[PDB]
RNA sequence: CGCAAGACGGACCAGAGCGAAAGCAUUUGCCAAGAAUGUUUUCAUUAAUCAAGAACGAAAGUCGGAGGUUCGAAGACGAUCAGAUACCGUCGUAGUUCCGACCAUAAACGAUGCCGACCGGCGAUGCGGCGGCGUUAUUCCCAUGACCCGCCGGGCAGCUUCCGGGAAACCAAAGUCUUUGGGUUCCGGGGGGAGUAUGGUUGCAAAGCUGAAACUUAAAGGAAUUGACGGAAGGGCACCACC
């Protein structure tokens, strides 16, 4: 008889300041009753939103998982919880006559966020190459993977979450990896394929609001 | 009381399309996905188990979900469709295209389209035996 | 008598090849032997492109693609007409069909 | 008869022979 | 080609063949004399050297061993003997 | 359900296990943007001007 | 079901190739040339042979038919064959020659020729289709 | 949205590589190996094949101990069926995982022993070496990578040729064979009985190795050809077919 949506309120979740677009969507939460509070069931929510919805002109195949942390003034505050590429984007570059280098690193920012970064790269057929395949030898693969790992470490461990996401928006990490590995073996489609949050520092409203600076 | 949709803006939802080969699930949730708004499957319309996957059941389910979402405020939808995944078939059932098109024809605005099929990294053994289904 | 010089498989210069399961019947077939097809299709069928695009929020979205690699056994390929029997002279032709 | 199943019958027969002269 | 004078072959063809397959086997290697700008005594070096041979009067090396021919270093002038 | 004088420039022929269904590619007169392929019974000759009654739900297959 | 049987085709082609002067776009001419030299004994046959010679004449104004040979078309083709251009195609003032063929000509005691022009060869050395 | 358990390394992944074979695919480090190439090093016949003997040897199976997701012999149901005791579906034990000890078998196959020589061509490809216009990164000539054009040596192969062979299918070896002899190991002698019995031996067991005869039989078999048939595929036709 009584539909539950008559006991439900709508909040306007928001993104941090490093994104051009602030309002990224709404969210439904039931009204507070009993021991249940409207916020504890709202903090643990993750929005998988395309980057093109958070930047005026950027790639649409990059997705950011933003997790709510509190609700101030019926506005849900979100921070960076993950970064991915779309399934079709990843599948559209795994061709069958090149080698794929998959590097990854557990690294920590200067502010205490522990991130696992996954970088993927694909060897590039030269514009004058006749040979069908563009494989790299195992030592070449190892050198490329080591360069990826050290570049990711030097580009995340020297920074904190805000500037790490700022350089993730245009994926400057992938461009740096490509220009470094060009000397070893030319690479074609290099990106930080994924970023996942392993452990993060204690919750603090100060840093949260400082992110929306 | 309800949503705060502006005059020209559209509020968004996320549509999960489980296009198996036994029936089609049309699911709608918040952008997060944590709050389920309304879910109608292909087996909620027809009682022919052969017909649970057929495109007509998907059309009926998608039109029902579009009506319920419109009466609940949501006007635009994000698309996140899946097959059975796992070790089983990695292809949408016969109702994925039909359900998507029925949502589009019901006056909905389609947002982004993504595939959320569970793709293992060579996970556990497939259901079929060594020789497979011999029928 | 030997119907095929390659024994109907690509195994050559090695001893064993990991098997894969048929995508239609779940039969274990060696990876080199299985018939492999790659489908890069549009998520919506060619008919439904117009109605999705006309009801798309963005301007010129450019629709995503389903990428699926299917592995079939011999029997399931013959039943699915992926390949068919060929004459003895034409069995030796490795050229993919012009399509 | 299939050669494998013929061999299986011979082995079962041999098992019965092993049993009877325990 | 049904008539090939194997007694007197082309010099290009014998230079093409393997060191052993030739009419009389000859090595593809040679000995050079390397001169350094600051030293006045010649040092003979094998073309396919297996060791890092050093110059006694200079801090630089004369050649790096490799999989084949040794890697001569710039700043040393080589002149092949014979 | 648009209404227009559809200029037909593409009639391919008949197909179907009852052989009365011709596939007509309805093209709009001065649009040159979209076309619809339909399986319809009856003689719809090449070059005729169809009466536009519906611009979706094309000839269904499978 | 109007495929002309080989009888009709052979008769019509022979008649056209033989007495094309008498044959225009008609039927009684065909029946007359039949009853004169190679008489055909029926009526539907003569009508179909007239129809096929009409069709072959329709196809013969646009060009020579494969199975027929008139003195007129053979004459035109042999005049085209006997065509002698006023200036030879091989009579070029200057001939571009690569350095390698230039060296070859030099080795043949033909390096002193003045009608050659040494042309710079290709900058790169790729000439194969990418394998795949 | 998290936690845990076990499994397995998808796409890249190839008629590609490595290994004696069985077999081998996430990274990184360590350990010992190995082919090939390069060598105007070294020893100097130290070599080849190989009874006895030895090492390794998929899966399943056995024993003992951990683990136990999924799959799944047996089994319990539910369908199909004339009946199914099967195929199909839901479960489900042993097993499927790791360790130790057994076993020593596969269509363990290239159904093709190893060492050596000789006898056509072509295009590729993996590794190493060598030479050489040119493009490209290292923001510098030369190195060196990435390509491009060749050459050499081993390797997995491929196309082509009446080299030649073969019953042919086919094989650049399955050729260099009545023009029969490079070296050497194993092994077959019409089909069944039968890889059975028995003895020996090995094994906890399963079973493994060696292994007959009486008797019975005029054929069994190989390759290819034509036809017929196919609940094989692709086209076409028929109101004695259908709609």
Structural class of chain B: alpha/beta
Structural class determined from secondary elements of chain F: mainly beta
* SSE order of chain F: EEEEE
CATH domain class name of chain B: Alpha Beta
PDB class: ribosome
Keywords: 40S, Nsp1, betacoronaviruses, cryo-EM, ribosome
Entry title: Bat MERSr-CoV NL140422 Nsp1 bound to the Human 40S Ribosomal subunit-State1
Chain A: Small ribosomal subunit protein eS1
Describe this structure in words.
Chain B: Component of the small ribosomal subunit. Part of the small subunit (SSU) processome, composed of more than 70 proteins and the RNA chaperone small nucleolar RNA (snoRNA) U3. Chain B: GO terms for molecular function: mRNA 5'-UTR binding; RNA binding; structural constituent of ribosome; translation regulator activity. Chain B: InterPro entries: Ribosomal_uS11 (IPR001971), Ribosomal_uS11_CS (IPR018102), Ribosomal_uS11_sf (IPR036967). Chain B: Keywords: Cytoplasm, Isopeptide bond, Nucleus, Phosphoprotein, Ribonucleoprotein, Ribosomal protein, Ubl conjugation. Chain B: This is Small ribosomal subunit protein uS11. This is part of a larger assembly, with 7 protein chains of 7 kinds. Chain D is mostly helical and 22 residues long. Chain D has 1 helix and no strands. The radius of gyration of chain D is 10 Å and the shape is rod-shaped. Chain D starts with a helix and ends with a helix. Chain E has 82 residues and is mainly beta. Chain E has one domain: N-terminal domain of TfIIb (Single Sheet). In chain E, the strands form 2 sheets. Chain E has a 3-stranded antiparallel β-sheet, with no helix packed on it. In chain E, strands 3-4 form a two-stranded antiparallel sheet. In chain E, a hairpin with a 6-residue loop joins strand 3 and strand 4. The radius of gyration of chain E is 17 Å and the shape is elongated. Chain E starts with 10 loop residues before the first helix and ends with a strand. The radius of gyration of chain F is 11 Å and the shape is globular. With 62 residues, chain F is mostly beta strands. In chain F, the strands form 2 sheets. Chain F has a 3-stranded antiparallel β-sheet with strand order 2-3-4, with no helix packed on it. Chain F has a two-stranded antiparallel ribbon with strand order 1-5. With 132 residues, chain G is mainly alpha-helical. Chain G has a domain of 61 residues: Diphtheria Toxin Repressor, domain 2 (Orthogonal Bundle), CATH 1.10.60.20. A two-stranded parallel ribbon of chain G has the order 1-2. In chain G, helix 1 packs across helix 3. Chains in contact: A-B, A-C, A-G, B-C, C-F. The interface between B and C is medium-sized, with 31 and 25 residues. Chain A binds one RNA strand of 243 nucleotides through strand 6 and helix 3.
């Amino acid at each position: 008889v009584v539909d539950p949506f008559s006991k439900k309120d709508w909040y306007d979740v928001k993104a941090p300041a490093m994104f051009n677009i602030r309002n990224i969507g709404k969210t439904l939460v039931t009204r507070t009753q009993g021991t249940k509070i409207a916020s504890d069931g709202l903090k643990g929510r993750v929005f998988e939103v395309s980057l093109a919805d958070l930047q005026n002109d950027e790639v649409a195949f990059r997705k950011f998982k933003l997790i709510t942390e509190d609700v101030q003034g019926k506005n849900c505050l979100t921070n960076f919880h993950g970064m991915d590429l779309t399934r079709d984007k990843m599948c559209s570059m795994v061709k069958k006559w090149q080698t794929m280098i998959e590097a990854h690193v557990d690294v920590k920012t200067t502010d205490g966020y522990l991130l696992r970064l996954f970088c993927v790269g694909f060897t590039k057929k030269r514009n004058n190459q006749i040979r069908k395949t563009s494989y790299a030898q195992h030592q070449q693969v190892r050198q490329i993977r080591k360069k990826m790992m050290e570049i990711m470490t030097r580009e995340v461990q020297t920074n904190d979450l805000k500037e790490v996401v700022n350089k993730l928006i245009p994926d400057s990490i992938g461009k740096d990896i490509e220009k470094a590995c060009q000397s070893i073996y030319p690479l074609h489609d290099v990106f930080v394929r994924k970023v996942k949050m392993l452990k993060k520092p204690k919750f603090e409203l100060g840093k949260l609001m400082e992110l929306h600076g | 009381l309800g949503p705060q949709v502006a005059e020209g803006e559209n509020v968004f939802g996320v549509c999960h399309i489980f296009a198996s080969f036994n029936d089609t699930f049309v699911h709608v949730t918040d952008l997060s996905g944590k709050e389920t708004i309304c879910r109608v499957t292909g087996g909620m319309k027809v009682k022919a188990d052969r017909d649970e996957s057929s495109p007509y059941a998907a059309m009926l389910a998608a039109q029902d979900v579009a009506q319920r979402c419109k009466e609940l405020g949501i006007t635009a939808l994000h698309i996140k469709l899946r097959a059975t995944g796992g070790n089983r078939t990695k292809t949408p059932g016969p109702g994925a295209q039909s359900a998507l098109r029925a949502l589009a024809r019901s006056g909905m605005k389609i947002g982004r389209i993504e595939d959320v099929t569970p793709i293992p990294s060579d996970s556990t053994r497939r259901k079929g035996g060594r020789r497979g289904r011999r029928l | 008598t030997k119907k095929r010089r390659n024994n109907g498989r690509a195994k050559k210069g090695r001893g064993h090849v990991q098997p894969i399961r048929c995508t239609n019947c779940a039969r274990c077939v060696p990876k080199d032997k299985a018939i492999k097809k790659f489908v890069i299709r549009n998520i919506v069928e060619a008919a439904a492109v117009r109605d999705i695009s006309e009801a798309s929020v963005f301007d010129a979205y450019v629709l995503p693609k389903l990428y699926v690699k299917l592995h079939y056994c011999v029997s399931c390929v013959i039943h699915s007409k992926v390949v068919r029997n060929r004459s003895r002279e034409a069995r030796k032709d490795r050229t993919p069909p012009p399509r | 008869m299939r050669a494998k199943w013929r061999k299986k019958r011979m082995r079962r027969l041999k098992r019965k022979r092993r049993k009877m002269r325990q | 080609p049904l008539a090939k004078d194997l007694l007197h072959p082309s010099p290009e063809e014998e230079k093409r063949k393997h060191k052993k397959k030739r009419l009389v086997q000859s090595p593809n290697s040679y000995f050079m004399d390397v001169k350094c700008p600051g030293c006045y005594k010649i040092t003979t070096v094998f073309s396919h050297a297996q060791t890092v041979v050093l110059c006694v009067g200079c801090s630089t090396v004369l050649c790096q061993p490799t999989g084949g021919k040794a890697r001569l270093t710039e700043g040393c002038s080589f002149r092949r003997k014979q | 359900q648009p209404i227009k004088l559809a200029r037909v420039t593409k009639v391919l022929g008949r197909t179907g296990s009852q052989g009365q269904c011709t596939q007509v590619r309805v093209e709009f007169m001065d649009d040159t943007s979209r076309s619809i392929i339909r399986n319809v019974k009856g003689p719809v000759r090449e070059g005729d001007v169809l009466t536009l009654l519906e611009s979706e739900r094309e000839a269904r297959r499978l | 079901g109007r495929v002309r049987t080989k009888t009709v085709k052979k008769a019509a082609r022979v008649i056209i190739e033989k007495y094309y002067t008498r044959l225009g776009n008609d039927f009684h001419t065909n029946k007359r040339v039949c009853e004169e030299i190679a008489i055909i004994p029926s009526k539907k046959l003569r009508n179909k042979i007239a129809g096929y010679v009409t069709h072959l004449m329709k196809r013969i104004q646009r060009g020579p038919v494969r199975g027929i040979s008139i003195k007129l078309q053979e004459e035109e083709r042999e005049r085209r064959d006997n065509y002698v251009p006023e200036v030879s195609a091989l009579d070029q003032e200057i001939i571009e020659v690569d350095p390698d063929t230039k060296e070859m000509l030099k080795l043949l005691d033909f390096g002193s020729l003045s009608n050659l022009q040494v042309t710079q060869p290709t900058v790169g050395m790729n000439f194969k289709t990418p394998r795949g």
